[PDB]
Amino acid sequence: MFVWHEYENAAEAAQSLADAVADALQGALDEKGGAVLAVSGGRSPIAFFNALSQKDLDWKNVGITLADERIVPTNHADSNTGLVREYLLKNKAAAAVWIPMVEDGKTETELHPDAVVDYALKHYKQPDVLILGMGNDGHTASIFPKAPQFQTAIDGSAGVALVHTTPVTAPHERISMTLDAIAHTGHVFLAIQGEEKKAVFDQAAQGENREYPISLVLNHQGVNCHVFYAE
Known part of the structure; x- marks a missing residue:
């Protein structure tokens, strides 16, 4: 219940992912006159x-936001x-509408996780297209396996889209899409x-x-993940 795309060259993987994501966005624009794209951070998606x-x-x-x-x-x-501002919201995509997760202009002592989640929930729109990444621990989004909030993150009973998580093994409190939110994203x-990530992926x-929290996405009913891998 996924499709595997492998490249030798990072540049080709990035271009090929961009091509597929643009086509998925176009389909949403054709169907309904608007689209929402959620992306993940780190270094690996920058060329994309x-x-x-x-x-x-x-x-x-097109609205753009974060996973x-x-x-x-x-x-x-x-x-x-x-x-995302440095690497994505430029060129033609600078015209996208930004859907915030953290409010601009707030300093560290003004950012309290509960209030941050509440602000983010007020702006959230269900994505049409989501690009995930995966850590060496198998986490995705900020659904980290040792987070004390893990059971909340996987509880889709009320459809709640965003959750505060504490990674434990990585810095900073986080706001994450939930498993439910990911699973109900169309693409x-x-x-x-x-190879290290291919090995963790295979597990x-x-x-x-x-x-390995990504396993809960890969194995979720109704989810068909399009996986783009570069050596």
Whole structure:
């Protein structure tokens, strides 16, 4: 219940993911006149962001947001908002509508996780297209296996879209899409690079195990993840 795409060359993987994501966005724009794209942070998606930013889509009708965010000011080095502004919201995609996860202008002592989640929930729209990444621990979004909030993150009973998580093994409190939110996204992509991540992916692919949270997405009913891998 996933499709595997492998490349030798990172540049080709990035372009090929951009091409597929642009086509999925176009389908949403054709169907309903608007689209919402959620992206993940870190380094691995940057070349993809750059390629996607050049696509001649109707970006003014596309909302862009995050799958997860570090609860830090948006000018902080570890802000995914800052990441996305640097590498994606440029070229043709600069016209996209930003759907915030952390409020601009707030400093560290003004950012309290409960209030942050409440603010983010007020702006949240269900994505049409989501690009996930995966850590070496098998986590995805900020659904980290040792988070004390893990049971909340996987409880889809009330459809709640965003959850505060504490990674334990990585810095900063987080705001994450929930398993429910991911599972109900129409088009889900996963981008991963390197043999270490291919090995963890293959474990996760074996079946559901909360030790490798991406496994809960790969094995979820109704989810068909499009996986783009570069060595």
